[PDB]
């Protein structure tokens, strides 16, 4: 089973002159989008991003929607507030971000609670691990730190992260666990490409795997290469699955000395592959 997380990522973006700030809430269950609220619409509402959430009733949606609209307008003020703290123009576009949530163990219990803020892409404030105190990241933030102290919000948010957060996380995994546990194994193969002089390039591809977590290695006679092995970041196929490769420059004629390994969670055992010339 392993641990689990319920996380919300929120974005408030002012675009002065062009209308109201774009507001966005995305919810994740175990790093998997499952709800979204997007203010850019005539009647915005919270909405299911995974079919297993359609199991929840119009009552639930209404209630999350109303919360989100509240949060939206509150963040709208926060944007005007922040201009003040920072002595900034009322003309520029600015961004507030928030990441907050809870992760629990296999036993359903709270491993960790957190909430962190960022303005224009830099850390702003955060609830410390002790779920009771704040770390302000700069001087403007100290104003909020002291404001959130003089209003006891380190205790109010402590109830959420330990109570409703954890509880709903259990309700969520309940209906989504069969889909969440899904696994698509990588299919791998090695391509061969030229190179100036007496060198060639060997590329190990891994395609169609979920989730994105994967590991590729190259071996010269049983020993990982590290040094000057090239790779790309894991990237989406666009269809729910992922892609990675790793490549080595080897000597022409010495290709059969090299072995590629694919470690993924869906595999009965790591794949082992060789360049094979048809």
């Amino acid at each position: 089973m392993g641990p689990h997380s319920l996380r919300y990522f929120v974005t408030a973006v002012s675009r002065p002159g062009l209308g109201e700030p774009r507001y966005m809430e995305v919810g994740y269950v175990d790093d998997t989008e499952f709800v979204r609220f997007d203010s850019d619409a005539e009647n915005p509402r919270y909405e299911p991003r995974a079919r297993w959430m359609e199991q929840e009733g119009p009552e639930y949606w209404e209630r999350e929607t109303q919360k989100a609209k509240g949060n939206e307008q509150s963040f709208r003020v926060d944007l005007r507030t922040l201009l003040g703290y920072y002595n900034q123009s009322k003309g520029g576009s600015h961004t507030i971000q928030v990441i907050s949530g809870c992760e629990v163990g296999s036993d359903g219990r709270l491993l960790r609670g957190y909430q962190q803020y960022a303005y224009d892409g830099c850390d702003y404030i955060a609830l410390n691990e002790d779920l009771k105190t704040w770390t302000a990241a700069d001087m403007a933030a100290l104003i909020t730190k002291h404001k959130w102290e003089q209003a006891g919000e380190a205790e109010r948010l402590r109830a959420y992260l330990e109570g409703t957060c954890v509880e709903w996380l259990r309700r969520y995994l309940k209906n989504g666990n069969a889909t969440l546990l899904r696994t698509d194994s990588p299919k791998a193969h090695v391509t061969h490409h030229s190179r100036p002089e007496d060198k060639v390039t060997l590329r190990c591809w891994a395609l169609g795997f979920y989730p994105a977590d994967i590991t590729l290695t190259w071996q010269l006679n049983g020993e990982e290469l590290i040094q000057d092995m090239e790779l790309v970041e894991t990237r989406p196929a666009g269809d729910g699955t992922f892609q990675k490769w790793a490549s080595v420059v080897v000597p022409l004629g010495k290709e059969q000395y090299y072995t590629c390994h694919v470690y993924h969670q869906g595999l009965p055992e790591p794949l082992t592959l060789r360049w094979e010339p048809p």
Binding site: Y8, G27, K67, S74, L82, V98
Partner: peptide
Amino acid sequence: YTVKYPNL
């Protein structure tokens, strides 16, 4: 589900 965020 979601929390209400405090003003900054």
